[PDB]
């Protein structure tokens, strides 16, 4: 498939920090297509959820400023601001925001994905479509990555990487 | 057009349900973001 990277420039669209449902219009109504995190004026989600499409609050436009297909990450309103890194052997929580469900934290001890590069945490939890972009947090309440890009095992199990970059 | 609606705060909850499994797998990530288990 194609790859791309975007890296950009801040605008002249204010949101409270926290975890958001990303919804899309009808007819029939709105449907959750994914999840994102607002931290320090920047909205962070996964590339495949929005594909760079304009977000809207109230209100007015919120436009992409940084994106990476390989990473499967995108940020609206500024560059990436989630700088926390997962440590090998530390347990994490996923704040899973599934369609039509209350948010719920799930604690897990990730395994590891070995690449030629290095190591990425592996989260063997299986949430419904629409919940990609849910944040993965550490003990300090800091986001170490986003959930929703992964692999299927030889046993049929779904296993997400911890999608993270390096902030700023 | 896409909309955004607040759901929760970024907070660790103390008595969280524990779940999942710790796999150790070799993968490649290609440029389009696809992860594949090394076969």
């Amino acid at each position: 498939g194609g790859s791309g990277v975007l890296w950009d420039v801040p605008s002249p669209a204010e949101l409270e920090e926290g975890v958001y449902r990303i919804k899309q219009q009808g007819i029939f109504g709105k449907t959750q297509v994914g999840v994102g995190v607002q931290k320090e004026g920047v909205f962070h989600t996964m590339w495949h959820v929005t594909r760079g499409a304009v977000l809207t609050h109230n209100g007015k436009r919120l436009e992409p400023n940084w994106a990476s297909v390989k990473k499967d990450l995108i940020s609206y309103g500024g560059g990436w601001r989630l700088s926390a890194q997962w440590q090998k052997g530390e347990e994490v929580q996923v704040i899973a925001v599934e369609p039509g469900k209350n948010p719920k934290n799930f604690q897990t001890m990730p395994g590891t994905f070995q690449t030629t590069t290095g190591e990425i945490g592996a989260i063997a939890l299986d949430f419904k479509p629409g919940t990609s972009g849910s944040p993965i947090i550490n003990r300090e309440g800091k986001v170490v990555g986003l959930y929703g890009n992964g692999v299927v095992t030889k046993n049929g199990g779904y296993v997400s990487g911890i999608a993270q970059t390096n902030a700023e | 057009d896409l909309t955004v609606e607040k759901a929760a705060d970024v907070t660790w909850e103390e008595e969280a349900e524990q779940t999942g499994v710790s796999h150790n797998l070799m993968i490649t990530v290609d440029d389009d973001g696809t992860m594949r288990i090394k076969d």
Binding site: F127, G130, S132, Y158 | -
Partner: peptide
Amino acid sequence: LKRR
């Protein structure tokens, strides 16, 4: 499959 691979994505949520």
